[PDB]
């Protein structure tokens, strides 16, 4: 891997953003880390009420105004915000030549499951109501947001809503019990995600609900009829087997799946694209995938 990977690993091993003693310290810690990758001056952000869900339109000079990605940020359903993910949003807008709607979906523990899925489905329906066309749309998300992307597609399908052209999952979290083999075998090489913090956040999101609840843990959802999926995941991830098991379930349900395992990459390495060449390479691949499915 690039030299930059060792630098990102060293930062994460020291910051340990999922190991802060309070939820507010975890939220503030991630916001502090995100402000290190500051927005290019050509990014336009417009706050919007996306049908009762706060959001930001993210636009760059070559954004096609009629193509839209609904972007669902990661953070265990507990942390993350418009501020933590606006840089990843603008990099995808730039690569896919589209507008991105980055939503502030309700977070746990304040708002347990299914609040996040209620908000993502509301924002997608709002995009349709305000004139976006599914053939020019996609849903994308990282980590918890990658799980939320799959759950959003399932909920929309089940409500008879037309599904978008494609969807993208970056290191998705779809097993809220952490029983994948990699949760053991990759624990040594993962500097960000371990079982104990995942179970902490899963408890906040589930609030005592079955951890195999299909819209919380879409490894247990019916995936038939979903649009083409790109799953990007790093091999230095305890969540590697979340992606592998999701690909298996989706393909078994007839979904076009592209599973891309990136050797030695860490959780949501794309967020470090300002410094990490493999992060920018992975984002260029996301843009290629979306533009292919919008042709």
The 3-class SS string of the chain reads CCCHHHHHHHHHHHHCHHHCCCHHHHHHHHHHHHCCCCCCCCCEEEEEECCCCEEEEEECCCCEEEEEEEEECCCCCCCCCHHHHHHHHHHHHHHHCEEEEEECCCCCCCCCCCHHHHHHHHHHHHHHHCCCCHHHEEEEEECHHHHHHHHHHHHHHHCCCCCCCEEEEECCCCCCCCCCCHHHHCCCCCCCCCHHHHHHHHHHHHCCCCCCCCCCCHHHCCCCCCCCEEEEEECCCCCHHHHHHHHHHHHHCCCCEEEEEECCCCCCHHHHCCCCHHHHHHHHHHHHHHHHHHC
d(CA 151, CA 159): 12
Contact yes or no for 243/142 (Cβ under 8 A): no
User: Do strands 54-59 and 98-103 pair parallel, antiparallel, or not at all (unpaired)?
Assistant: antiparallel
Distance CA 205, CA 111 (A): 8
Round to whole Å and give the CA distance between 149 and 92: 16
Cα 28 from Cα 76, distance rounded (Å): 15
Cβ contact 146:169 at 8 Å: yes
Residue 21 CA neighbour count, 13 Å, CB half: 0
Q: 124: domain range?
A: 1-295
Over the range 24-59, which residues count as b (16 or more CB within 10 Å of their CB) and which as e? eebbebbeebbeebeeeeebeeeebebbebbbbbbb
C-alpha neighbours within 13 Å on the C-beta side of residue 162: 12
Distance CA 132, CA 138 (A): 11
* 162 Cβ neighbours under 8 A, 6+ residues apart: 128, 134
How far apart (Å, rounded) are the C-alpha atoms in residues 92 and 115?
Answer: 26
Rounded to whole angstroms, the maximal C-alpha distance in the chain is 48
Cα 116 to Cα 41: distance, rounded to the nearest angstrom: 31
CA atoms of 291 and 295, how far apart (whole Å):
6
Quote the CA–CA distance of 241 and 219 in Å, as a whole number: 11
- Number of structural domains, the chain? 1
For 22, other C-beta atoms within 10 Å of its C-beta total 8
Cα 215 to Cα 220: distance, rounded to the nearest angstrom:
8
Give the resolution to one decimal, in Å: 1.5
| C-alpha–C-alpha distance, residues 25 and 23, integer Å | 5
Lookup result for tokens 């417009």: 46
Contacts of 4 (CB under 8 A, 6+ apart): 272, 275, 276, 277
Q: State the burial class of residue 264 (Cβ atoms within 10 Å of its Cβ: 0-12, 13-18, 19+).
A: middle
Q: Residue 240 is encoded by which pair of tokens? A: 């590697």
Q: Name residue, tokens 């053939």.
A: 135
């Amino acid at each position: 891997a690039s030299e930059a990977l060792t630098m990102i690993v060293n930062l994460l091993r020291s910051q340990r953003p999922l190991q802060e003693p309070t939820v507010e310290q975890m939220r503030a810690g991630l916001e502090a880390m995100a402000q290190m990758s500051p927005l290019p001056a050509d990014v336009e952000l417009t706050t919007v009420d996306a049908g009762g869900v706060p959001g930001a339109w993210v636009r760059v000079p070559e954004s096609d105004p009629d193509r839209v990605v609904l972007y669902l940020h990661g953070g265990g359903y507990v942390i993350g915000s418009i501020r933590t993910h606006r840089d990843l949003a603008q990099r995808i807008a730039r690569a896919a030549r589209c507008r991105v709607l980055l939503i502030d979906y309700r977070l746990a523990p304040e708002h347990p499951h299914p609040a996040a899925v209620e908000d993502s489905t509301r924002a997608y329906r709002w995009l349709l109501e305000t004139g976006s066309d599914p053939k020019r749309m996609a849903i994308a998300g990282d980590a918890a947001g990658g799980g939320l992307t799959v759950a959003t597609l399932v909920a929309l399908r089940d409500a008879g809503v037309p599904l978008p052209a494609a969807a993208v999952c970056l290191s998705p979290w779809v097993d809220l019990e952490g029983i994948g083999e990699s949760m053991t075998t990759k624990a040594a090489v993962d500097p960000m995600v371990q079982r104990e913090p995942l179970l902490r956040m899963a408890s906040m999101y589930l609030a005592g609900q079955d951890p195999r609840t299909p819209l919380a843990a879409p490894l247990y959802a019916d995936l038939r009829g979903l649009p083409p999926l790109l799953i990007q995941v790093g091999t230095a991830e305890t969540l590697l087997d979340d992606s592998v098991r999701l690909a298996e379930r989706a393909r078994a349900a007839g979904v076009q799946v592209t599973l891309e395992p990136w050797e030695d990459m860490i959780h949501v390495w794309q967020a470090f694209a300002a410094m990490l060449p493999e992060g920018q390479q992975a984002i260029e691949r996301i843009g290629e995938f979306l533009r292919q499915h919008w042709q």
